[PDB]
Design a protein around this nucleic acid. Structure first.
Ligand SMILES: Nc1ncnc2c1ncn2[C@H]1C[C@H](O)[C@@H](COP(=O)(O)OP(=O)(O)OP(=O)(O)O)O1
Ligand SMILES: [Ca+2]
Ligand SMILES: [Mn+2]
Length: 430
DNA sequence: ATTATGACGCT
DNA sequence: AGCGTCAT
């Protein structure tokens, strides 16, 4: 009852860019705007692999991981932009730099956690509390929430989608008790007002549109964000959780999309997040471990405590390349040349990072894959990163991997390498 | 031949 | 530390 925590202490948003790499290319090339288009990497194998898809192209069935040649079968007029190639490999610098544009704007509003190249969590609890004082018990107009959906509404008492959106927003606002400065629903609503402002600023200052979720924690904010893409934001209230979760496949919740989620389904014989409420915390801990069990027990009730971490910059800087099928590296000269290519991109990015962010990486992580293994990595080894020098880093990487070679012979490499990976880690202030 | 990343958990 | 999971 009165002592039962409800996980309504925070206001958390998740802001996620719409079809991000496509928008970056569409800003650069106006011919691609408002078209079915996709971003591809490489080209010689089946037209290249698609990594981002405009909403116009999605209507034709084009998806990520599709070969461009195959996408063209669904959408003959599909336009394509290619990822830059430098030193023989895909280079994602344009998108990392566009990401910084967005992250720096968001940081003006609140402390953010960079969750990916195109999304960040926002802890808005303090900002909400300041805005609530400014409001002075003044009601929140629908005009302040022009792109907001209230999940679960309208209910009860309608043809167009925008009209449905407004109907739900009106029901929500009509029911709001603005007299209580500690009402969680009011706090979320003010959070949503701030996120409208944030999203408007991002679009004004970069050209990029985004979606967002507003709720009481990161998992609900993430889930909310996807409910009404693109270019819209969604408020998921604590009260909306029982209905929302009653038909929500377990795999849709962040961290449950893989083996753990499959195990929850198999072991408990359930399908939807809401069905988890019928198990005790100890029951869930017995199957999934102490940490997962407690997390699931609270999460299926809409409660999660994971903080928005104050971190805007990536913790690592890495450079990776696959060498599939017959392109696998089978000579020592090959392995050395590609280690150098990777190290040269790594040095470039490291040197810029040191100048921009007043830090230095101290550990180099080297990872490879061998033909036949179908784990991501076959072997991971670290060594010291003492100088930002590509020839040194590539020599050091070779040194830590070189006994991998089963080939008796000097020059040959067996089994051939199908992936190389260099990663700079363990930053210290500088 | 679903690539190039990047965070965090386990032991 | 080196490996695995999950994610975009
Ligand atoms: N599996 C991947 N491999 C390589 N790049 C990826 C992969 N997934 C995502 N990206 C890149 C390209 C995306 O534009 C960008 C952001 O990913 P993501 O948020 O999942 O989709 P998206 O921004 O392209 O569309 P959406 O509007 O659905 O969010 O990160
Ligand atoms: Ca996105
Ligand atoms: Mn994303």
């Amino acid at each position: 009852g009165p002592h039962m925590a409800t996980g309504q202490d925070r206001v958390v948003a998740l802001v996620d860019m719409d079809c991000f790499f496509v928008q970056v290319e569409q800003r650069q090339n106006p011919h691609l705007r408002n078209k079915p288009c996709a971003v591809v990497q490489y080209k010689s194998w089946k037209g290249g692999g698609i990594i981002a898809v405009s909403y116009e192209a999605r209507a034709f069935g084009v998806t990520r991981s599709m070969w461009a040649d195959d996408a063209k079968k669904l959408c003959p007029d599909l336009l394509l932009a290619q990822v830059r190639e430098s030193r023989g490999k895909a280079n994602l610098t344009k998108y990392r730099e566009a990401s910084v544009e967005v992250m720096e704007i968001m940081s003006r509003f609140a402390v953010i956690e960079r969750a990916s190249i195109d999304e960040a969590y926002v802890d808005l609890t303090s900002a909400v509390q300041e805005r609530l004082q400014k409001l002075q018990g003044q009601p929140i107009s629908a005009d302040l929430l022009p792109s907001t959906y209230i999940e679960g509404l309208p209910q009860g008492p309608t043809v167009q989608k925008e009209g449905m959106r407004k109907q739900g927003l009106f029901q929500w606002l009509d029911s709001l008790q603005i007299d209580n400065l500690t009402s969680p629903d009011l706090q979320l609503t003010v959070g949503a007002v701030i996120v409208e402002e944030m999203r408007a600023a991002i679009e004004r200052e970069t050209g990029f549109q985004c979606s967002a979720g507003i709720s009481h924690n990161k998992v609900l904010a993430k889930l909310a964000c996807g409910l009404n893409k693109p270019n819209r934001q969604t408020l998921v209230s604590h009260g909306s959780v029982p209905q929302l979760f009653s038909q929500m496949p377990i795999r849709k919740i962040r961290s449950l999309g893989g083996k753990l989620g499959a195990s929850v389904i198999e072991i408990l014989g359930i399908e939807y997040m809401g069905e988890l409420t019928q198990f005790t915390e100890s029951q869930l801990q017995s199957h999934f471990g102490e940490k997962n069990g407690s997390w699931l027990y609270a999460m299926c009730r809409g409660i999660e405590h994971d903080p928005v971490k104050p971190r805007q910059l990536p913790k690592t800087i890495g450079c990776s390349k696959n060498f599939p099928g017959k392109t696998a590296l089978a000579t020592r000269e090959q392995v050395q040349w590609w280690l150098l290519q990777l190290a040269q991109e790594l040095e470039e990015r490291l040197t810029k990072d040191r100048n921009d962010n007043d830090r230095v990486a101290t550990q180099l992580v080297v990872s490879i894959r061998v033909q036949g293994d179908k784990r991501l990595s076959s072997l991971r080894r670290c060594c010291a990163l003492t100088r930002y020098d590509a020839h040194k880093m590539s020599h050091d990487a070779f040194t830590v991997i070189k006994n991998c070679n089963t080939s008796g012979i000097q020059t040959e490499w067996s089994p051939p390498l199908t992936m190389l990976f260099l990663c700079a880690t363990k930053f210290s202030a500088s």
